[PDB]
Structure 1
Amino acid sequence: PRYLKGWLEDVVQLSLRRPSVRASRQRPIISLNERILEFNKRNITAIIAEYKRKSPSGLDVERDPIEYAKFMERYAVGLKILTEEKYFNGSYETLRKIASSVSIPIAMSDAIVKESQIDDAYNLGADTVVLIVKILTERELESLLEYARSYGMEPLIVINDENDLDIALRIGARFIGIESRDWETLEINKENQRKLISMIPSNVVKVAIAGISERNEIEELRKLGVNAFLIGSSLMRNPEKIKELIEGSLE
């Protein structure tokens, strides 16, 4: 409910009409941001793996989601599951099945614009949600953050520019994702990403999103203060690429 155009305008209107669910969940929330800090202290590279059937920035991959999630349970600090229907071909049922099969933190990612979507994430088994600042007004973002926290979740608040970063800090975000991808244009800008990272308080748990493909980048970014890395497409196509990213290579 910011002023939007193109596909982002369309996905927001679509999400406003997303039917809520009556699935049930009671198990404790497994904090994603806390496990990231845990990994940092154990000196283990923290990679959040994404499950997405398709996306505006890639090709459709039809693989068994459970098989994928269980493999990732061995390496990833957490999972991000895309549930948006039109542009990511996602489903609440996929999130539900994955959450019921693995024991690592799960983050539901969608165009979250209404509180029932947060109810949905909790009811389906997600441990947290991903809020996109680019599509929300300051008022909606703060309200959704306050709402998510009432469930015991600490949302990953995603930004890709300075003004949106300020808004995230201003509303009290403690878990921020810095996007190198502008979802409006799909262009990648790593210089901007690093500039934004340098501007974030050290207490914030920082997740570098997109554009990560080799361990060298990871090590560089860690030294710059990044706590975790969100990697999707590369892993959706070749899951075992995560081994090198965490353990290094024999060359």
Structure 2
Amino acid sequence: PRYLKGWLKDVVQLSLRRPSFRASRQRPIISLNERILEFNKRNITAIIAAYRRKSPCGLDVERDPIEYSKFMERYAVGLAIATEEKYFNGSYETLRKIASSVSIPILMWDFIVKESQIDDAYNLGADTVALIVKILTERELESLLEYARSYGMEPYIVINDENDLDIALRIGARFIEICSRDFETLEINKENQRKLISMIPSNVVKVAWGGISERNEIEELRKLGVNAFGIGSSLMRNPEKIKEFIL
């Protein structure tokens, strides 16, 4: 990966030593970006609900993932499952189990640093995997994207600043997350996110992920051309809010 600092260096040092999940896949690949695109044409608000136990920030929520996922299946466009243990208190078994109970698309939220994690994602039943620009070299990024595409999955490229977007466009991304939170400082900047969203071309699937708590933000970002809107801690405390975000 790139030369890193703080907690990002650690989560990356650990992700490499993380051992694989070696068991055959037991569900089809259900395209998230494609279903999002369909939702837009169907005028439905597309929301990726996140099943994350603990924030990297550090504040846990213990709840049955199968009751959450099953509920979300009825409303969400897709499910983002946090599978990092140290800072996100998630696991591969939480993914495998959720993926066995739901039929909507599933996104693996992790710090992918090696090809095996992309095998893990497939095998466990994840429909797509998140690739963080801020955490990989350009050629590492081009390889993982290619590898995930050799599995049928269309990688979910996370950008944070105008530099991440430069590399994102250079690698040939077609599914972009515009993270309003800086991975190292853990701060939200909606001005910066909005600027970045304006710079991403029409043909690319856009996900505004930050600290979304109300519909008026989703309306605003939609008026700015974003396709899907990722919510986590807001839905992790109260999952029923989704009905209001859809409205």
TM interval, short-chain normalised: over 0.9
Unaligned runs of 5+ in 1: 247-251
Distance 1:161 1:179 in 2: 8
CA-to-aligned-CA distance 1:142-172 (integer Å, 9 cap, x gap): 1000000000000110001001101011110
| Aligned-residue offset at 1:28 | 2.2
Equivalent positions of 1:52-131 (< 5 A) are 52-131=52-131
Q: Is the 8 A contact 2:58 2:87 kept in 1?
A: no
TM-score (norm 1): 0.97
Unaligned runs of 5+ in 2: none
Distance 2:159 2:239 in 1: 26
Mean Cα deviation higher: 104-113 or 52-61:
52-61
| Aligned-residue offset at 1:2 | 0.6
SS for the counterpart of 1:58 is coil
| Aligned-residue offset at 1:186 | 0.4
Distance 2:60 2:133 in 1: 26
User: Where do 4+ consecutive residues of structure 1 move more than 3 Å?
Assistant: none
CA-to-aligned-CA distance 1:56-101 (integer Å, 9 cap, x gap): 2351000000010000011100000000110101110000000000
TM-score (norm 2): 0.98
Q: Is the 8 A contact 2:70 2:102 kept in 1?
A: yes
Distance 1:37 1:211 in 2: 23
CA-to-aligned-CA distance 1:88-138 (integer Å, 9 cap, x gap): 011100000000000000001111100000000000000010111111111
Distance 2:99 2:23 in 1: 12
Match of 2:205 in 1: 205
Q: Is the 8 A contact 1:190 1:211 kept in 2?
A: no
Distance 1:37 1:108 in 2: 20
Q: Is the 8 A contact 1:58 1:233 kept in 2?
A: no
| Aligned-residue offset at 1:3 | 1.1
| Aligned-residue offset at 1:27 | 3.1
Q: Is the 8 A contact 1:210 1:232 kept in 2?
A: no
Match of 2:186 in 1: 186
Identity %: 92
| Aligned-residue offset at 1:223 | 1.1
CA-to-aligned-CA distance 1:197-251 (integer Å, 9 cap, x gap): 00000000000011211111111111111000010000000001111111xxxxx
Distance 1:172 1:183 in 2: 22
Mean Cα deviation higher: 14-23 or 40-49:
14-23
SS for the counterpart of 2:199 is coil
Cα separation, partners in 2 of 1:66 and 1:213, compared to 1, 3 Å? same
SS for the counterpart of 2:212 is coil
Q: Is the 8 A contact 1:138 1:167 kept in 2?
A: yes
Distance 2:151 2:197 in 1: 28
SS for the counterpart of 1:23 is coil
Distance 1:144 1:28 in 2: 21
| Aligned-residue offset at 1:26 | 4.7
Aligned residues: 246
Q: Is the 8 A contact 2:48 2:77 kept in 1?
A: yes
Distance 1:200 1:120 in 2: 30
RMSD between aligned residues: 0.8
Distance 1:195 1:52 in 2: 28
Distance 1:234 1:213 in 2: 6
Match of 2:148 in 1: 148
Q: Is the 8 A contact 2:47 2:76 kept in 1?
A: yes
